[PDB]
What does this fold into?
Amino acid sequence: SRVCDLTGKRAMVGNNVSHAMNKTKRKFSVNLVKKRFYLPEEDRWITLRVQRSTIKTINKNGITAVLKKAQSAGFI
Amino acid sequence: MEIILKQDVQNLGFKDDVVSVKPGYGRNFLIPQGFATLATPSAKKVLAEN
Amino acid sequence: SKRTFQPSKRKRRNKHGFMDRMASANGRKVLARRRAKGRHKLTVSSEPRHK
Amino acid sequence: PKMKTKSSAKKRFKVTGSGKIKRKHAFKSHILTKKSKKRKLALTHSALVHKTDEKSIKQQLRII
RNA sequence: CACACAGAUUGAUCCGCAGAUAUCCGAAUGGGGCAACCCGCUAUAUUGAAGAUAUAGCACACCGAUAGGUGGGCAAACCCGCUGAACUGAAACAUCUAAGUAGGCGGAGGAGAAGAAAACAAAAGUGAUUCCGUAAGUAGUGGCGAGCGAACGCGGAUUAGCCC
RNA sequence: CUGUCUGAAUUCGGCGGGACCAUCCGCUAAGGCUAAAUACUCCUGAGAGACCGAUAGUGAACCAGUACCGUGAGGGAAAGGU
RNA sequence: GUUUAUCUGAGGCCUAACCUCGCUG
It folds into this structure.
């Protein structure tokens, strides 16, 4: 669904409390982006639907390490 | 970021030197074109300076 | 005048048949409810065909 | 189950030593500049719940 | 049951346990379909050749490198996770309650969850989790309205600690 | 606990003691497993009731989720005694 | 009053993320 492929981050359910404390159901969505990452150790291109928060940890560690860590736990 | 240049950059230059660029310039251009490598676990792996 | 029930033994099976109940996810719960209650006659497909 | 004590009545209405209920006075909130000092001095000491309201106050405080 | 016909001290009938056979539909799994039907392919044999037959193998997903293994679905309650109302009460009603209830979805076991301190406590101390009685309708919370409501400590059931 | 953004040090370190600060006290997060005491009955074996006795007790003591009603989901009886 | 290394407010240009089209990359 609308979940990250490398972390499994799902959406969140919450409220939409107004000024008069009126509450209504609401969905906090994940900032998913469809990037095209280049594998430097294999010269290959993959198309994932990762989030902007895990793009940050990709830039922090490396795409290979993030992929090898997401391979465990069943892509979650 | 913290990249290690491989061939040359117009404004960066001086290959084999740690450079700090904006995240999105090394990931979309330098990494795919082979000009730099994101090397955090390599500051010690760069032993060619010996 | 014309009544509300105009029988057709193919329009009946295409709407209430066993293969029409078993095709849906929520139509498959009708079978479970009827089997739990103990209905001797399941969906209209239980009516015998002409021999 | 257990009878719950009404909070509005438990925050007020302190019970006295033997059989009475002690409470405060009203009207001493925000317009005290035009009331005589006699009224403001009388409305300062604590009062007792009247016998006509004692049954309701005791039912609220869960002392039947 | 009745007119009968048969079996059975060579030991029947009957009971307990362990086996064989087990048509068609149905997850239905060779394709399809209007459930209990229709129509096939490859190997053999039957006039074998047309019309047809008898037996075996023919769905999907994963992994096993390959001979092959695992799972499809159904079904009481308990338990877990994801979602999730309104009537009602407030003698009206929107905050609140009803209620994380009813309902919907997925998985596992005889139980499940939790479980071994980045914990309580207070100048004295206890030492994993779970459940029962008090603490207590107390502290507190609340258009401070309706209402909601702990914890510390104490007494018991059981007791177990270990691996990266 | 996080939907989004930002983002620390390694033991004279880090967290907690109900805003917050200093001192004392306790613990050592960002890895995992773990029986017992606890909840239930589609069932199984044994046994009870100051429980019902055929308009009662399960809808159903009897060819009952049956006969009948509806297109369907579904609703749903009466009927014991020589 | 200017210079050097940063922040920010606006425009222009480049392609290398992102979008689209034509032949099959």
User: Anything to note?
Assistant: Chain C is about 35% helix and 0% strand. Chains C and B do not touch (no CB pair under 8 Å). The two ends of chain C are 33 Å apart (CA to CA). The helical segments of chain C are 13-16, 18-21, 28-37.
